[PDB]
Ligand binder design. Structure first.
Ligand code: HEA
Ligand code: HEA
Ligand SMILES: CCCCCCCCCCCCCCCCCC(=O)OC[C@H](COP(=O)(O)OCCN)OC(=O)CCCCCCCCCCCCCCCCC
Ligand SMILES: CCCCCCCCCCCCCCCCCC(=O)OC[C@H](COP(=O)(O)OCCN)OC(=O)CCCCCCCCCCCCCCCCC
Ligand SMILES: CCCCCCCCCCCCCCCCCC(=O)OC[C@H](COP(=O)(O)OCCN)OC(=O)CCCCCCCCCCCCCCCCC
Ligand SMILES: CCCCCCCCCCCCCCCCCC(=O)OC[C@H](COP(=O)(O)OCCN)OC(=O)CCCCCCCCCCCCCCCCC
Ligand SMILES: CCCCCCCCCCCCCCCCCC(=O)OC[C@H](COP(=O)(O)OCCN)OC(=O)CCCCCCCCCCCCCCCCC
Ligand SMILES: CCCCCCCCCCCCCCCCCC(=O)OC[C@H](COP(=O)(O)OCCN)OC(=O)CCCCCCCCCCCCCCCCC
Ligand SMILES: [Ca+2]
Ligand SMILES: [Cu+2]
Ligand SMILES: [Cu+2]
Ligand SMILES: [Cu+2]
Ligand SMILES: [Mg+2]
Lengths: 265, 547, 42, 260
């Protein structure tokens, strides 16, 4: 912009968007074939492309902040947007939590809905909340505390060794949750097909796990950034989203934990 | 300026706005077309067009014969065709057509100008919005050619996909439509975020929220609904996909499922949808009433608050769409009472409009006619909704043509009007070519004439009990049908008219050279700019006094 | 004519602050409500 | 044969009042219609009026008012009072229809794709009804000599094509019938416009609905909830007869013969 008076970021053209929309189309259409007896190849191609897109796109995001496009308002603009994203995320989970709560309260039975059945479902074996569940909840709370500690250092003391230290700790504890999570599946007392409790129990923690992984990945990115010195106490947006997001995951797990392990036994 | 550079790698919010428009036009036509097909078959009793026999002929082959009557005797009633059509319509129309012109075409382009911002907060993202919308559409269309229920192609299920019908239906057709819906969701949620950051963050100095144009507040409320309502619908349909692809049992009584919860999860998002469709419409009307009655929009705060009013109530009235699917009396009351409340907020909007016109001089220009039709018909529509809001009366009305009319009056004779309203009023601004004041009028008069014919009869049918989504009906119902169908053709005519009128104008229209071709009262910032606006609108920030 | 970062953001920072507060209000109001309902009719 | 509750060619109203709830439903709608008849008219009249009274050549100069307190208040209370009213005359008609009585008979109706399924738990009676055109009765759901003839033999005429069923569900005048609807496979809906009753058969669910006829005859209802291809091919027919011939119906339906 030849002669502007404003700090908002205006962007050169960009192919990324179109690319990613084809990747997804192919992704999903391959994903429909693959759940219909046919071959994976189409599905992975779709995702491979999308993943190429996303990386670029985000690489460029950083690159653009490095060219000093991320002025004061810009910085705030992204902050905001990301916050609607977690708002959205929160709504999605409201679907899964809504089924759980309805079935848990008004389970189906032969006289439904004059009369309700029984929950947990007959012959269902809910897990022990204090054995592994608590383990995974200590594991995230802890990681939470280790990722925020990174944040504050950087912003408050400008200590960068400490910053990367908080991050590794936090990142490897995120993966641990995954590992423990999977254990839980391995040892599950009920199945996934044919029984509401399996679908709810599985899809719900299924979605949460998705996110942890996303979370743990994200963080990974920051560590890397932090290793090549990409963050200052004033400018540190990836970091801000990261910590905000990790926190949302943790919140969601904590409510799950209270809703499905602790309250539904 | 590579052609591929411009539209294929767009970062500008005025072009993305155009892309959505035509895109949405396109599909509407296609969709609209499916509408004549139906009307055709429903013109008269028995099944003359959707016979079984045409299936033997390749698609190329029977297609063409399908546009030509057969005798009852030799006609083999293929209900599945009809179902797949009905749903081609619905799915296209509430997800590919009307929300992408009105929210992403007129909003994307103008909401920004009215506040006096350079461009949308997230340009790359926005472009991604527009492309996801295409995939959406494409999967959605492809679905009409893939392995459908009953050995045919195509999912004949319902715009909303209810189970167990939706979970038992063979093929992978419905899987495509499920994912279409997701990519559409995606689209609006990216869109939604972008306008929400944009509008709070990028407005011009001195522009207070209470200093913003109606139309951008409309997109603002619209956007919020979206944000909070699509998510819930991603979920619903994930449950339909895992039931049919992963043998789950969300809504499968054999596994302790409950088809009704689905209806709860889907109407909680299926109510917010309409308030998205009309929201923007309310916005474009104010403008147009303001400009053409050459007088400030009456009760501007109340208008804004009305809009918030609606949007909030819009999340707490979804069981009105389930009055007979097995609900507690306490649940019918709560939902009947609270759904009645929305009246307050809308009437206010309706009265203000009449009070804007009151005591101003009026310009019956094309744009205005629509705006006035809209005030009428949306009221028509409206009332019905109160009749439908009463569980009691709903029994008899639910699922019958009486509800078909109420939605088309507020959708086809409502939001749709808005769309056109928008179109006529802003065609030069975004083209540098004005349209013909005659044609327009003609179009407006045809459409009002025939669209009234199309749906008004349907009120009768509804009270004479004709059921919804039937491909044939009793002898008793021929009379009105005829009328209706006739009606539909007329309107279909008109839409053709309009496209040409459009074509012509973008070909041979009046070059536009003024920055405001209308009059002093159109006061927002879009009118200060050229005609067709600069590539980078607002490099220089609009000085406070400027407007 | 480059002066990156020297634009006035007073009005946006006030805005975000409001935004922040408004949502929190909202959220909490719902949960409350949900709870109410629960108590009243679950 | 008294065919009462049926669509009437070119009709723009309802179907005969066969029972109390129907009675009230018509009355409710009537009353609601005039209230909105007046609103609609009203709202156009200003529109028109204003459009002409203040068309540019009739009032060259615009005004600048944007607010009139007293009037806004008026137009926000008015409506509100209007709605309450409707309330007053609406809830009551929902409660009478959703609060189910002591039955004098009791059927159980089971939506099966492309046919209904009647049961009379006390009388150990259980039979199914299909349209006359169903492939269950040779046809492919469309008029044919065969069909025409079939219906004549039934006691119906060429014109009630899509409403007549091989198997009627008989019923007592003056008696309270409670119908507990459920679906078999996907979702259907059973309903009889003259009775003013209707509801959805849903897989995994017992829903109840009550009705009383005041008069005899053949009433006709249609499947209302997209339940597949022959969605427009699962008529419903309800007979209502004297109690003396209801009882003999009992005995006569015990021998496997399910027609009156
Ligand atoms: C944008 C589209 C749109 C809009 C804006 C509305 C608005 C309303 N709709 Fe609906 N509606 C649909 C689209 C829309 N609707 C669709 C598509 C369906 C079917 C979905 C499907 O099954 O596929 C449907 C279905 C539907 C049903 C269920 C039908 C059934 O059982 O099958 C109901 C029932 O309560 C309903 C109610 C209402 C009401 C009260 C409003 C209110 O918004 C109306 C408010 C407007 C007014 C009240 C007039 C303005 C007020 C005044 C002028 C004051 C004077 C008058 C009075 C005070 C009374 N709508
Ligand atoms: C708002 C969306 C919308 C629109 C515009 C329409 C428009 C029309 N629809 Fe409808 N229709 C639906 C949404 C819509 N429909 C839905 C959701 C259903 C229920 C689906 C289901 O059961 O799942 C339905 C159902 C439905 C049915 C009955 C279904 C049944 O048996 O159960 C009929 C019956 O005759 C019908 C007719 C028509 C006609 C003649 C038109 C029009 O052709 C008449 C007048 C309008 C026009 C002539 C053109 C308007 C054009 C545009 C708005 C273009 C937009 C793009 C640009 C402006 C650039 N529609
Ligand atoms: C098994 C192993 C297989 C692994 C495959 C590997 C593929 C790699 C995929 C990884 C993706 C990389 C993610 C990195 C994103 C973050 C980008 C970033 O941090 O820059 C953005 C900007 C930072 O700016 P700032 O911090 O201020 O700069 C300071 C410099 N002085 O801050 C911003 O602009 C904010 C941007 C936020 C990012 C948005 C995230 C939300 C989207 C979530 C959707 C989930 C997608 C997951 C994919 C699944 C497929 C559907
Ligand atoms: C019960 C409902 C719970 C809903 C779950 C929501 C999860 C919340 C996410 C928690 C993560 C926060 C942890 C903070 C650690 C480091 C980051 C931080 O402290 O950001 C501070 C920020 C203040 O921002 P500010 O000072 O205005 O920035 C410059 C101002 N010109 O303060 C912020 O802006 C933080 C922004 C993150 C927002 C995440 C998404 C918010 C969505 C709505 C949730 C509101 C929850 C309601 C809580 C009830 C309280 C009674
Ligand atoms: C993620 C980290 C933290 C967690 C984030 C998400 C929090 C979600 C917490 C709750 C989410 C919604 C839960 C709703 C529970 C409702 C249970 C239910 O289904 O009620 C039963 C009733 C129908 O019952 P029925 O079968 O019809 O009758 C049988 C009676 N014999 O069903 C009904 O009438 C409907 C019940 C009311 C529906 C409520 C739906 C609103 C959903 C939006 C929630 C808003 C979340 C905001 C979070 C704030 C974060 C900042
Ligand atoms: C109905 C619910 C369905 C759930 C789907 C929800 C959304 C799916 C889309 C995934 C990607 C979007 C992630 C959104 C994160 C946005 C956070 C934010 O505010 O990001 C800001 C950044 C700005 O973008 P830009 O215009 O380029 O601004 C440059 C300024 N330096 O924005 C970015 O960094 C943009 C990065 C986008 C990543 C590319 C991937 C596109 C994905 C499309 C596939 C959708 C399928 C969803 C499947 C979920 C199924 C449950
Ligand atoms: C009980 C069940 C309810 C059902 C859910 C209901 C939700 C419906 C959503 C509709 C969204 C509408 C939002 C509109 C709010 C507008 C209020 C407003 O603008 O107040 C004016 C105030 C004044 O600021 P002033 O300085 O005078 O002018 C600006 C100059 N910079 O402006 C400000 O201080 C800034 C205002 C910012 C606007 C806030 C927008 C957020 C509102 C959404 C709440 C989200 C709830 C999220 C719950 C799920 C979270 C996970
Ligand atoms: C950190 C560790 C974590 C630990 C945290 C511990 C705290 C746990 C917090 C849990 C919160 C979850 C709440 C669960 C909700 C349950 C309430 C419910 O589901 O009641 C439904 C109510 C009764 O259902 P009903 O069918 O009548 O049952 C009759 C049985 N005789 O249904 C009715 O009576 C019908 C009435 C319908 C009324 C609709 C009202 C709207 C609901 C709210 C509006 C949603 C709008 C939200 C907007 C979102 C966007 C902002
Ligand atoms: Ca026909
Ligand atoms: Cu609704
Ligand atoms: Cu059926
Ligand atoms: Cu049916
Ligand atoms: Mg229904």
């Amino acid at each position: 912009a030849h002669a502007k008076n404003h700090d908002y970021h205006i962007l050169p053209p960009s192919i990324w968007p179109f690319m990613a929309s084809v990747g997804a189309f192919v992704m999903l259409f391959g994903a429909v074939l693959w759940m219909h007896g046919s071959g994976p190849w189409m599905g992975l191609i779709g995702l491979v492309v999308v993943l190429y897109t996303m990386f670029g796109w985000w690489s460029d995001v950083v690159t653009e902040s490095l060219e000093g496009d991320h002025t004061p308002v810009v910085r705030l603009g992204l902050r905001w947007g990301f916050i609607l994203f977690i708002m959205s995320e929160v709504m999605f989970f409201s679907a899964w939590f809504w089924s759980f709560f309805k079935h848990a309260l008004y389970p189906m039975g032969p006289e439904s809905p004059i009369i309700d059945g029984i929950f947990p479902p007959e012959g269902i074996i809910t897990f022990d909340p204090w054995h592994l569940p608590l383990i995974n909840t200590l594991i995230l709370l802890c990681s939470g505390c280790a990722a925020t500690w990174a944040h504050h250092a950087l912003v408050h003391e400008n200590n960068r060794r400490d910053v990367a230290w908080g991050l590794a700790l936090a990142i490897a504890l995120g993966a641990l949750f995954t590992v423990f999570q999977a254990y839980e599946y391995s040892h599950a007392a009920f199945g996934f097909a044919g029984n509401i409790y399996g679908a709810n129990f599985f899809m719900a923690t299924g979605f949460h796990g998705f996110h942890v992984i996303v979370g743990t990945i994200f963080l990974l990115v920051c560590l890397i950034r932090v290793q090549r010195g990409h963050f200052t106490p004033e400018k540190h947006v990836g970091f801000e989203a990261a910590i905000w997001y990790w926190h949302f995951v943790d919140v969601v797990w904590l409510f799950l934990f209270a809703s499905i392990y602790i309250w539904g036994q | 300026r590579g052609f591929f550079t411009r539209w294929f790698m767009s970062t500008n919010h005025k072009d993305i706005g155009v892309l959505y428009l035509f895109t949405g036009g396109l599909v509407g036509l296609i969709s609209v077309a499916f509408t004549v097909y139906m009307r055709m078959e429903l013109m008269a009793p028995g099944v003359q067009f959707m016979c079984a026999e045409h299936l033997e002929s390749g698609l190329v082959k029977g297609f063409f014969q399908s546009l030509w009557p057969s005798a009852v005797e030799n006609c083999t009633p293929n209900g599945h065709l009809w179902n797949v059509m009905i749903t081609g319509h619905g799915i296209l129309m509430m997800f590919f057509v009307v929300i992408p012109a009105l929210f992403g075409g007129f909003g994307n382009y103008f909401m920004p100008l009215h506040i006096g911002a350079p461009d949308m907060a997230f340009p790359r993202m926005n472009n991604l919005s527009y492309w996801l919308y295409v995939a959406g559409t494409s999967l959605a269309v492809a679905s009409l050619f893939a392995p459908g229920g009953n050995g045919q192609l195509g999912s004949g299920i319902g715009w909303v996909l209810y189970p167990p019908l939706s979970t038992s239906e063979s093929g992978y057709s419905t899987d495509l439509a499920i994912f279409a819906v997701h990519l559409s969701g995606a689209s609006s949620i990216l869109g939604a975020i972008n306008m929400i950051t944009t509008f709070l963050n990028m407005r011009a100095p001195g522009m207070t929220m209470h200093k913003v144009p109606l139309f951008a507040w409309s997109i603002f409320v619209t956007a919020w609904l979206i944000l909070l309502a699509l998510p819930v619908l991603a979920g619903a349909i994930t449950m339909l996909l895992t039931d049919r692809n992963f043998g789950t049992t969300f809504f499968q009584p054999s596994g302790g499922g409950d088809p009704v919860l689905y209806q709860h999860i889907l109407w909680f998002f299926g109510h917010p949808q309409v308030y998205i469709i009309v929201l923007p419409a309310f916005g474009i009307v104010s403008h147009v009433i303001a400009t053409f009655a050459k007088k400030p929009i009456f009760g501007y705060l109340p208008m804004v608050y009305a809009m918030v009013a609606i949007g909030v109530l819009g999340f707490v009235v979804w069981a009105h769409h389930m009055y007979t699917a097995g609900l507690s009396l306490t649940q019918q009351s709560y939902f009947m009472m609270a759904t009645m409340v929305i009246a307050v907020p809308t009437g206010i909007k309706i009265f203000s409009w009449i009070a804007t016109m009151w005591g101003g001089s009026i310009e019956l220009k094309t744009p205005m006619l629509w705006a006035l039709g809209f005030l009428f018909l949306f009221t028509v529509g409206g009332v019905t909704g109160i009749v439908l809001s009463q569980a009691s009366v709903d029994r008899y009305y639910h699922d019958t043509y009486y509800v078909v009319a109420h939605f088309h009056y507020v959708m086809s004779l409502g939001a749709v009007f808005g769309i056109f309203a928008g179109i006529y009023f802003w065609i030069g601004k975004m083209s540098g070519r004005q349209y013909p004041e005659w044609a327009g009028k003609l179009h407006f008069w045809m459409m009002f004439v025939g669209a009234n014919l199309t749906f008004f009869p349907q009120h009768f049918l509804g009270r004479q009990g004709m059921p919804r989504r039937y491909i044939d009906y009793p002898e008793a119902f021929a009379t009105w049908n005829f009328v209706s169908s006739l009606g539909a053709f007329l309107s279909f005519a008109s839409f053709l008219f309009f496209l040409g009128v459009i074509f012509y104008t973008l070909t041979r229209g009046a070059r536009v050279t003024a920055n405001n071709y209308w009059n002093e009262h159109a006061d927002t910032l879009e009118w200060t700019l050229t005609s067709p606006p600069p590539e980078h609108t607002f490099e220089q920030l609009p000085k406070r006094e400027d407007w | 004519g480059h002066v990156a970062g020297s634009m006035d953001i007073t009005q946006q920072e006030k805005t975000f602050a409001g935004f922040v507060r408004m949502v929190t209000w909202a959220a909490v109001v719902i949960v409350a409500a949900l709870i109410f309902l629960a108590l009243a009719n679950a | 044969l008294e065919i009462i509750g049926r669509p009437q060619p070119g009709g723009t109203g309802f179907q005969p009042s066969a029972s109390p709830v129907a009675t009230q439903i018509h009355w409710l709608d009537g009353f609601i219609l005039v209230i909105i008849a007046a609103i609609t008219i009203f709202v156009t009249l200003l529109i028109l009026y204003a459009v002409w009274r203040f068309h540019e050549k009739r009032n060259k100069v615009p005004a600048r008012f944007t607010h009139n307190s007293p009037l806004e208040i008026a137009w926000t209370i008015v409506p509100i009072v209007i709605l309450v009213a409707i309330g007053a005359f609406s809830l009551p008609v929902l409660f009478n229809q959703q609060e189910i009585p002591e039955a004098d008979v009791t059927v159980k109706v089971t939506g099966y794709q492309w046919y209904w399924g009647y049961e009379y738990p006390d009388e150990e009676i259980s039979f199914e009804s299909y349209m006359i055109g169903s492939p269950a009765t040779g046809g492919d759901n469309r008029m044919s000599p065969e069909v025409e003839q079939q219906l004549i033999e039934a006691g119906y005429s060429r014109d009630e094509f899509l409403l007549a069923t091989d198997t009627a569900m008989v019923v007592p005048v003056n008696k309270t019938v409670v119908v507990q609807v459920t679906g078999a496979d996907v979702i259907h809906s059973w309903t009889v416009p003259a009775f003013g009753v209707k509801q959805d058969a849903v897989p995994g669910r017992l829903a109840q609905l009550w009705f009383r006829a005041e008069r005899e005859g053949i009433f006709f209802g249609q499947c209302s909830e997209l339940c597949g291809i022959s969605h427009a091919y699962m008529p419903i027919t309800v007979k209502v007869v004297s109690e003396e011939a209801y009882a003999a119906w009992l005995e006569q339906a015990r021998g496997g013969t399910y027609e009156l």
